[PDB]
Amino acid sequence: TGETIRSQNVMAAASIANIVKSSLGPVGLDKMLVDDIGDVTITNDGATILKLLEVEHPAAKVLCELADLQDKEVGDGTTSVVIIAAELLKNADELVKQKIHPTSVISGYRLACKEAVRYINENLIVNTDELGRDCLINAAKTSMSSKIIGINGDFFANMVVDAVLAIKYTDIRGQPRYPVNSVNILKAHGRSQMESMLISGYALNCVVGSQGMPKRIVNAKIACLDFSLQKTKRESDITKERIQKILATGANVILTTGGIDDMCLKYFVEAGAMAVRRVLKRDLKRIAKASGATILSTLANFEAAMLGQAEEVVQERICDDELILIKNTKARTSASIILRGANDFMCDEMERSLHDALCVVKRVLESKSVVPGGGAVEAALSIYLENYATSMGSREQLAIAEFARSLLVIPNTLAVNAAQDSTDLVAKLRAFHNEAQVNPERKNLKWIGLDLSNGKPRDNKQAGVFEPTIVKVKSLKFATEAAITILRID
Amino acid sequence: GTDSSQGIPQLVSNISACQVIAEAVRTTLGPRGMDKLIVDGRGKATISNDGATILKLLDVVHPAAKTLVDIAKSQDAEVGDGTTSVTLLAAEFLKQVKPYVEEGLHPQIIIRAFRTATQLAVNKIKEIAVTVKKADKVEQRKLLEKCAMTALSSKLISQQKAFFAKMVVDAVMMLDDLLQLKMIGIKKVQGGALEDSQLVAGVAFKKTFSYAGFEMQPKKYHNPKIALLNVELELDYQAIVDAEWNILYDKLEKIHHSGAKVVLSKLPIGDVATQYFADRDMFCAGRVPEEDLKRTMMACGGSIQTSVNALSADVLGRCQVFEETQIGGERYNFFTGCPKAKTCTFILRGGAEQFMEETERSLHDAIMIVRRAIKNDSVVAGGGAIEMELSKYLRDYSRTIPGKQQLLIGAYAKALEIIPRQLCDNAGFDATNILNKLRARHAQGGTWYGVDINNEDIADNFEAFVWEPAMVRINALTAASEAACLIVSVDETIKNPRS
Amino acid sequence: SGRKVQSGNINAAKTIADIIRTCLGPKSMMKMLLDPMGGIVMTNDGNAILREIQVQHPAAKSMIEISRTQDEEVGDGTTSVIILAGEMLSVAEHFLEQQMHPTVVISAYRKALDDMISTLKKISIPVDISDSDMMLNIINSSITTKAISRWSSLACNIALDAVKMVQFEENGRKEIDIKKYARVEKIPGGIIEDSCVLRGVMINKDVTHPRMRRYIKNPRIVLLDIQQLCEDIIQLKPDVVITEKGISDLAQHYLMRANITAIRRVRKTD
Amino acid sequence: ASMGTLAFDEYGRPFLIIKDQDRKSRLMGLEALKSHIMAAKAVANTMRTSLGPNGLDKMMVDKDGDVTVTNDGATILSMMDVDHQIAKLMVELSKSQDDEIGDGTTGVVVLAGALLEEAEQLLDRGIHPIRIADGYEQAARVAIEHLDKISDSVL
Amino acid sequence: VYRNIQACKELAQTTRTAYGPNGMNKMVINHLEKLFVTNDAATILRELEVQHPAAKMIVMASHMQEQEVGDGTNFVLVFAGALLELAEELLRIGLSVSEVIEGYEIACRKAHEILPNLVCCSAKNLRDIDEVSSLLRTSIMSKQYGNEVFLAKLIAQACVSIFPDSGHFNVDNIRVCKILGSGISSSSVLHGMVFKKETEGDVTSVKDAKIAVYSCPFAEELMNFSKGEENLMDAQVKAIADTGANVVVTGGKVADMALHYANKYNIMLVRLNSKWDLRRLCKTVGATALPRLTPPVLEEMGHCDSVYLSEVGDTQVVVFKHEKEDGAISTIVLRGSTDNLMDDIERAVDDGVNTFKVLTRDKRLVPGGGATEIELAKQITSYGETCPGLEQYAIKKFAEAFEAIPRALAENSGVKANEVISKLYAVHQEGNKNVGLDIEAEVPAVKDMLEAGILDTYLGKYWAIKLATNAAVTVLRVDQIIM
Ligand SMILES: Nc1ncnc2c1ncn2[C@@H]1O[C@H](COP(=O)(O)OP(=O)(O)O)[C@@H](O)[C@H]1O
Ligand SMILES: Nc1ncnc2c1ncn2[C@@H]1O[C@H](COP(=O)(O)OP(=O)(O)O)[C@@H](O)[C@H]1O
Ligand SMILES: Nc1ncnc2c1ncn2[C@@H]1O[C@H](COP(=O)(O)OP(=O)(O)O)[C@@H](O)[C@H]1O
Numbered sequence A: 001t002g003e004t005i006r007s008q009n010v011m012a013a014a015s016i017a018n019i020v021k022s023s024l025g026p027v028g029l030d031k032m033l034v035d036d037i038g039d040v041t042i043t044n045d046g047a048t049i050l051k052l053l054e055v056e057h058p059a060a061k062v063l064c065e066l067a068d069l070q071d072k073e074v075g076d077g078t079t080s081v082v083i084i085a086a087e088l089l090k091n092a093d094e095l096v097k098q099k100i101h102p103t104s105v106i107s108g109y110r111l112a113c114k115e116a117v118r119y120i121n122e123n124l125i126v127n128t129d130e131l132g133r134d135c136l137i138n139a140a141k142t143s144m145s146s147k148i149i150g151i152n153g154d155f156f157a158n159m160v161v162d163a164v165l166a167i168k169y170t171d172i173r174g175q176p177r178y179p180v181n182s183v184n185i186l187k188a189h190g191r192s193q194m195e196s197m198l199i200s201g202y203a204l205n206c207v208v209g210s211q212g213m214p215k216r217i218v219n220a221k222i223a224c225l226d227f228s229l230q231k232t233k234r235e236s237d238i239t240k241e242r243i244q245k246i247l248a249t250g251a252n253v254i255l256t257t258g259g260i261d262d263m264c265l266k267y268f269v270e271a272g273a274m275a276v277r278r279v280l281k282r283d284l285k286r287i288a289k290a291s292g293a294t295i296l297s298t299l300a301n302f303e304a305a306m307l308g309q310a311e312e313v314v315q316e317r318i319c320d321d322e323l324i325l326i327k328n329t330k331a332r333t334s335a336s337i338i339l340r341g342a343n344d345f346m347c348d349e350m351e352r353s354l355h356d357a358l359c360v361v362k363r364v365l366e367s368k369s370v371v372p373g374g375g376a377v378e379a380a381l382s383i384y385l386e387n388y389a390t391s392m393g394s395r396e397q398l399a400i401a402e403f404a405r406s407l408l409v410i411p412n413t414l415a416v417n418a419a420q421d422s423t424d425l426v427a428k429l430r431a432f433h434n435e436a437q438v439n440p441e442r443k444n445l446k447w448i449g450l451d452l453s454n455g456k457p458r459d460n461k462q463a464g465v466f467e468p469t470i471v472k473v474k475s476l477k478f479a480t481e482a483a484i485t486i487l488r489i490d
Numbered sequence B: 001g002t003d004s005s006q007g008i009p010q011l012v013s014n015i016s017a018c019q020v021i022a023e024a025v026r027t028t029l030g031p032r033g034m035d036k037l038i039v040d041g042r043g044k045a046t047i048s049n050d051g052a053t054i055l056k057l058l059d060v061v062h063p064a065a066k067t068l069v070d071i072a073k074s075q076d077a078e079v080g081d082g083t084t085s086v087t088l089l090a091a092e093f094l095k096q097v098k099p100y101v102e103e104g105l106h107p108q109i110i111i112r113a114f115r116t117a118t119q120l121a122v123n124k125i126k127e128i129a130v131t132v133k134k135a136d137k138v139e140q141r142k143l144l145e146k147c148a149m150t151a152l153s154s155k156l157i158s159q160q161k162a163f164f165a166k167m168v169v170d171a172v173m174m175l176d177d178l179l180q181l182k183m184i185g186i187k188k189v190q191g192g193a194l195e196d197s198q199l200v201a202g203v204a205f206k207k208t209f210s211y212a213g214f215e216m217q218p219k220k221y222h223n224p225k226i227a228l229l230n231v232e233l234e235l236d237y238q239a240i241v242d243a244e245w246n247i248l249y250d251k252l253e254k255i256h257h258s259g260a261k262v263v264l265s266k267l268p269i270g271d272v273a274t275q276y277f278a279d280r281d282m283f284c285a286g287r288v289p290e291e292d293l294k295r296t297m298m299a300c301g302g303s304i305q306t307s308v309n310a311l312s313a314d315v316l317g318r319c320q321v322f323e324e325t326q327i328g329g330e331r332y333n334f335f336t337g338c339p340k341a342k343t344c345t346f347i348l349r350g351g352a353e354q355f356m357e358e359t360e361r362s363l364h365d366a367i368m369i370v371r372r373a374i375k376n377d378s379v380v381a382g383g384g385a386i387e388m389e390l391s392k393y394l395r396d397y398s399r400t401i402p403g404k405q406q407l408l409i410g411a412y413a414k415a416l417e418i419i420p421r422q423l424c425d426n427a428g429f430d431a432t433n434i435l436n437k438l439r440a441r442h443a444q445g446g447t448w449y450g451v452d453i454n455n456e457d458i459a460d461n462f463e464a465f466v467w468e469p470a471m472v473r474i475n476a477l478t479a480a481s482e483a484a485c486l487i488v489s490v491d492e493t494i495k496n497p498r499s
Numbered sequence C: 001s002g003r004k005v006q007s008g009n010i011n012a013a014k015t016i017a018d019i020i021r022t023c024l025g026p027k028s029m030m031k032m033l034l035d036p037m038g039g040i041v042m043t044n045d046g047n048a049i050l051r052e053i054q055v056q057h058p059a060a061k062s063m064i065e066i067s068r069t070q071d072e073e074v075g076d077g078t079t080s081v082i083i084l085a086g087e088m089l090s091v092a093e094h095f096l097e098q099q100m101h102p103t104v105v106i107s108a109y110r111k112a113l114d115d116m117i118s119t120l121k122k123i124s125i126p127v128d129i130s131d132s133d134m135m136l137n138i139i140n141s142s143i144t145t146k147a148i149s150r151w152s153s154l155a156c157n158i159a160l161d162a163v164k165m166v167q168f169e170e171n172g173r174k175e176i177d178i179k180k181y182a183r184v185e186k187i188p189g190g191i192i193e194d195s196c197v198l199r200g201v202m203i204n205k206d207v208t209h210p211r212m213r214r215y216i217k218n219p220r221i222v223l224l225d226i227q228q229l230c231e232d233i234i235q236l237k238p239d240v241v242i243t244e245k246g247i248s249d250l251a252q253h254y255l256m257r258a259n260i261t262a263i264r265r266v267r268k269t270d
Numbered sequence D: 001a002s003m004g005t006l007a008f009d010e011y012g013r014p015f016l017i018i019k020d021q022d023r024k025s026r027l028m029g030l031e032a033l034k035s036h037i038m039a040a041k042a043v044a045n046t047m048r049t050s051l052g053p054n055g056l057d058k059m060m061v062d063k064d065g066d067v068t069v070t071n072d073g074a075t076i077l078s079m080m081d082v083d084h085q086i087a088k089l090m091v092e093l094s095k096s097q098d099d100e101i102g103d104g105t106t107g108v109v110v111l112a113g114a115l116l117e118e119a120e121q122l123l124d125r126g127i128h129p130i131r132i133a134d135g136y137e138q139a140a141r142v143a144i145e146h147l148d149k150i151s152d153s154v155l
Numbered sequence E: 001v002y003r004n005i006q007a008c009k010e011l012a013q014t015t016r017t018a019y020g021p022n023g024m025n026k027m028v029i030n031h032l033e034k035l036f037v038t039n040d041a042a043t044i045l046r047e048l049e050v051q052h053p054a055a056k057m058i059v060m061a062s063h064m065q066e067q068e069v070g071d072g073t074n075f076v077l078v079f080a081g082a083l084l085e086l087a088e089e090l091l092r093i094g095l096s097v098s099e100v101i102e103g104y105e106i107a108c109r110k111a112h113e114i115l116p117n118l119v120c121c122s123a124k125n126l127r128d129i130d131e132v133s134s135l136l137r138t139s140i141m142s143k144q145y146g147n148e149v150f151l152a153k154l155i156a157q158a159c160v161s162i163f164p165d166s167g168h169f170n171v172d173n174i175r176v177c178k179i180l181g182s183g184i185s186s187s188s189v190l191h192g193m194v195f196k197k198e199t200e201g202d203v204t205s206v207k208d209a210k211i212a213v214y215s216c217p218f219a220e221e222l223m224n225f226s227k228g229e230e231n232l233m234d235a236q237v238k239a240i241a242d243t244g245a246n247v248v249v250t251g252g253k254v255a256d257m258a259l260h261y262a263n264k265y266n267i268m269l270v271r272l273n274s275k276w277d278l279r280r281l282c283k284t285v286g287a288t289a290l291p292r293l294t295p296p297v298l299e300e301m302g303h304c305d306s307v308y309l310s311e312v313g314d315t316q317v318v319v320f321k322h323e324k325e326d327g328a329i330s331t332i333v334l335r336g337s338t339d340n341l342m343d344d345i346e347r348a349v350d351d352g353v354n355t356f357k358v359l360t361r362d363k364r365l366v367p368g369g370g371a372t373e374i375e376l377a378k379q380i381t382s383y384g385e386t387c388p389g390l391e392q393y394a395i396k397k398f399a400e401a402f403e404a405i406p407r408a409l410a411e412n413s414g415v416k417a418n419e420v421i422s423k424l425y426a427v428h429q430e431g432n433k434n435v436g437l438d439i440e441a442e443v444p445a446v447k448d449m450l451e452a453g454i455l456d457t458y459l460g461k462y463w464a465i466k467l468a469t470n471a472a473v474t475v476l477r478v479d480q481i482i483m
């Protein structure tokens, strides 16, 4: 037995979608994955799901490698591309089942993809400029939402966005760049989380190497070293010649990762240095690149100019903790965030929220061309493409029409995964975007999407729910290519 | 051995049965629609291009199918022949709400949205309906004659078709009393040219071996009326044979005394005794058809006799004149010449023996098309033009409604599109391109472009004089929506057998 | 799929939850285990029965692993967790069926646990530290009702010293503690009362030839893994150096020249 | 092809729509017309050999077992085991022709079979039967006028 | 005992979806295999021939409920089913049947003594036809959908207000005459009893007319037999016309000779009489049947005061008015496409009549639409924890059984039941008794319907609660029987 093989391929694609459908979105459910030996696997995102999924049917496999190659380009939306492709496949298979030849389907899908990708460029947003302040803060708070830490959350958002914008790079290409490992969390004791303020640079809690440091020195050349200044029994005891030579080269603040010297206090006040222990290697490289220096395997054999410099060093006790304020180096990379509370363990939620805010702000800072989130883009394309098809004229009317209808599967999945009624929310989105083009007065209504925190229609340009333009463009193009490749098989 | 009677499974079963019922009679819509010979199981195959007759002869056991058929029959008896259209529309509603009830859409939301969309369509149709009654219809009847043309367009009978349309239209003006199906009939005549068909203010019934008594009747008689007798007249030995002779003698005396020009007896009158029964001196007949009777009491009032020597004033009452002439070499029997001869019969004069079906499909539509044109005033372009306009309105208004009704009204608009689809299917053309062009032109270019059956291309059917009563379409759409609502409103089926 | 998968998971959960729901308390029933060979074992412990039983459903395996990993974390309560989880899932039965999404259930459960923590912190009566009377009351509450009823004093004194010889004032005030750095020596022989506590670790291994000094008033133990290192140790001259290499007689005298007493064949556990 | 559509459900739960479609048969349009015209082949190419002076006779036996040899086509097709409805319609076509003419029973059946066969390989080219019917009516009137061209009368 | 609980639960679940105005229709195939569409719970249950004896008990309890309240049977089914299904898990806990029985009895008494504390009653009286018609919209919305209630309430109330004599009201006089034809809006009201006849020899202005009801409705030798038949027919008609008989009613046919004889004495030939008319005529005008045509005697002869044909509805029908009570009988004339939707309309009319009669027995009304149900549930479940002992579990379960009904109404409306019940229960603490569920909105929003006037009866609800509780108690007591 066996008939209309394309139907079986479409059913396989639909099954692959239904495996991953409910997992889309931050509030998506988890999945249990079992192998032959019975290993455990719990995850939400579908990229690793398809990475570890055991697919058997060839047509489903094709979707698997298309999702995989989608992952290698932008690393996001693989669930969305798979769902869009499956919906397009089922709609096109239906259209074939009412005897429309698939060549017109493919032509209409290609034309609709081109029309939509051209429409994206004319309806995107570039508000992620220096003037975007409230949107950044509320986007960071939506990333930080469902947390009690939101009482002082606005101050945290302000300080974190200020730190990430100040630490911004300037690469050869010119596009803004930000090092993720440059900033890190740092616990504090005493006053609660409501008083956790900004730290202008990287600070390490260690022994006071030199308390007599000037508040703002004229020049603070950071000289990170690994060799310890300990007495033994080019020098037999590496205590004086190394530090004297590195000071004579020009370095002012000489940092030794190892332990301190017994008499180093006298040397470090007359040379503007200090021996700070427990320097993290992941942070040692960060401070070396901030100053502009590099780690030294050995001081023996550079140090006059290779070792980086800073224009001020502060040695003061803050919130019952003395910190080594090696801040404002040559390159703005040295930064840290103080976490006020009792310990690292109960502050896991706030450090995780700070990390996610950093990630989302760094994602929206680059790729200045941005689009609204929460399904606003899908509703906008669905409004555009139906009318465009109706105004197109040729035999590919139904192809583009079903393309427009299939672009509204993502909002349905988002609404389901948010426990809200899918049909009501998608209908509200589509109706809100109806007047976004029908009535030119409601021109600002184009940025209307789902509020996943509650499941209500709301503007997301103000709310800051943002995605890169390139990610969505390549997602749509990959989905259309996969749909064409599958539909051209019989 | 599969049992499925739960709420949602029963709903899908019912609407799938409706889908099958529609699939049975999909292809019979339109004037150029094809047909099927269905045998009743008794050896009598049946051909009838009308969908309503097909459902009447069809028998299906599913309760949902039974309800849909009952609604179709109710629509049939009210106005026109929209049974195929309404059944297809309701089935389209059901098949496009399949993917909505299949995942959890509660039936009441669908019912409410369908009612809202039906109200929207019945209100948006009135802004497009155009009245033509004052545009020279009662007098200067060129437009009504063109409406008659539209029922028989694109055929070589056009030379005869113009005369036949003037025929039926003049019959309409002299019978403009809201003509019906039974008030006008046709009779078959073999031989002669097609042009020779002509209208007689009466009926035609050829005399057979058991119909009439003898020839050379007094045709030019001032007051001949139909007389119906319920007594035998045709032709121990001295006890019943002499009784038979006495009965024959007294019946002959009664016939002579009555003087009725036309006499009908309940027993058949044999032609073997034509010389035996030629002594009656006036026309005698027998075995009168019931249709001929029903066409004569309302003509001039033929009487019925119910006694051995029954005599009535209407055996020889007031009717104008009697017609009895050789039609095709055989003398017919016309019960014409009646003051209230409200029955005009089109003499089927043609050289084709199997032309009866083409005459029925080609002469019954003209009288119906002109009658529906006269009865209503507001009309809209046919051939799916109004359906496409309603679909565009409902689709553009669905996106304006925030709520679950949006997808339901969208599916309703998508389901209003089958009429052009079915018309172009029965025309044999590929549906995709013609529907595509029609939809694009209707949405962008014009509000009345409809399907063309002649050149097989998109055209403004408003200019092609493709008319249809606005009220008939309104009530047909309302009935289809009500049927869809009732069939969606099902949850459980209860049988509880007595046995 | 749909609700059926969650229903299967939570049914497999309830089955292994109520398979041993009777096995806790001071009057626990004893369960009956037989392998398919005729071997018979009579068990009264939840961990043992859950270990020996074989089940295939992934949810059951996951919860068994949860119980097993919680066993080493805290010890007592290893079955109450399973009973509580099973009962909570069995009551969530009724909300899964009436078509409410699991997300609201998770939110409600998290709010309930947040209230749980505060309510527990409220009603808990305070108890002091190291005071003998209520400490022994605790010993009777938890340690007793077992096979040490007639020998509770040895357990009491061992616990009393143990809670004081593993103190870690690393990042606070003694709040850090470990249960694996205690040099426990379970050597059979003699009466059970021979147990005692000695301050400082002791090693089951020593020098093969005791013609040499081991005890010094200032033992500067140095960890270590060719005599080059032996006479490079002279950098500070520690009295005793612990290594994992064999020492010869000439090597032993080299150690004496180096003022060190090395050891051999000692595992990392020591 | 076989068993129609093989899904048994839309998601995977137990479900059934058509009662025992495995041993049933569904035909929609072209396949039905092919069945009818294949019946037309059966009847016509059975009938054809009794045409003309060299027309041989036929032996046909019903389920009863009646011995019958004839040469008039209507008589051959009169009592043969007719199974398909259009074949039966051709049977009363021949019956009517015999009733109102009495000669030429062989001609009508063979002509109809040829027309229907050529119509089927017309359909094989993808053409809708309405056009073929119109063209055949035009052919009919052409043939009728051609017959009227060379008519002749007797006493 | 669990099998009985399962049977009752399935029976309740079958008719649960029909609760409220948003009830699904039912495909009803009777014993004689006839199509039938309806949503009324009583109609399907009276057609449902269930087999489990517990189902028999619950259905006969519902029948007793309909006996003296006239409606609410769907409510008692849903309530008793909820009670039994909760009692199922209570028994599964390990409790005894006896103790849950006393708990349910205590809960029922508590509900009965707290019910009269929701006073939203009739305004002033059964008069003010428009006002009471607005009051009577409850059962009309219940059975028939809300689309036609505006006219159905007026048609149903104008007829029952015709004869408000001495405060005594009766139902049997209220009848509905079947008249097919135009749309529903064309339906109207009339006074008396309406049925059609055949002949046209009718006299309108008639004094006291004696109704003659028939128990049994309608060559020389040939001439002799014809003359004998003529003489027999003449004798029969003169026997009919004895004692000055002026009106005669019959379920038979007409004849030219028969109508000639009828007009010989100037008597109308009432024919094609309905099969239901033979004894309703006897009970409405004091008539009686005749074994044949010869024995109409004055002692066994009817008496009607007005016998005239009415052309209302474009149909020829004779109506009897100005009877002995001069206003007792009052019919309702209907108009619709077919009898299928006519049945639901007339059942809604009957429900309105019964609710009005309950109002005659009680001018005290209570809020409806899930208001009083959740109010009683709140009161009972608040009282529950204040009662020590084992009856407390039965008390909370009785409260949950009350909770069940608004959930059923919500899910019938198509909205999420859990959300709306949570919102309604939460608001009822401060948004007090008059709050309740809203039908129109697709969002699960609540709405106060003191202004809406949708208020169900008090005595009917009291009896429904009592009888459903008694039914659940009785079915809980039986243990098993071999079957
Ligand atoms: N807070 C939010 N509200 C609404 N939509 C969101 C939110 N966060 C993310 N999304 C949507 O989720 C989509 C990406 O989800 P997903 O495909 O699961 O990620 P990945 O591809 O990394 O697995 C984005 O297109 C974005 O629109
Ligand atoms: N000449 C024509 N060209 C195109 N369409 C036509 C023509 N004549 C009739 N129709 C279409 O036929 C339809 C009416 O068919 P209908 O009477 O419903 O068929 P049935 O009698 O089988 O139900 C109309 O909607 C009209 O559009
Ligand atoms: N003698 C006792 N009297 C009352 N309760 C007890 C007694 N012994 C133990 N329990 C209770 O039984 C619970 C479970 O403890 P136990 O069964 O000893 O270990 P586990 O929790 O590992 O099964 C404890 O919370 C305790 O309160």
Ligand SMILES: Nc1ncnc2c1ncn2[C@@H]1O[C@H](COP(=O)(O)OP(=O)(O)O)[C@@H](O)[C@H]1O
Binding pocket: D050, D051, D052, D053, D055, D072, D073, D102, D103, D104, D105, D106, D107
């Ligand atoms: N002698 C003949 N020469 C040529 N053709 C003949 C001759 N006899 C008969 N035919 C042809 O055979 C055809 C059919 O004849 P036949 O099958 O015998 O009887 P029927 O005419 O009833 O079918 C006729 O059309 C005729 O043209």
Ligand SMILES: Nc1ncnc2c1ncn2[C@@H]1O[C@H](COP(=O)(O)OP(=O)(O)O)[C@@H](O)[C@H]1O
Binding pocket: E018, E019, E020, E021, E023, E071, E072, E073, E074, E075, E138, E139, E141, E142, E143, E368, E369, E370, E437, E439, E454, E456
């Ligand atoms: N408009 C309305 N809004 C909300 N509830 C209503 C409305 N109309 C009627 N109801 C409810 O419907 C219930 C009765 O409906 P139903 O069970 O179908 O018939 P019955 O009256 O026989 O119980 C009443 O309790 C009433 O509260």
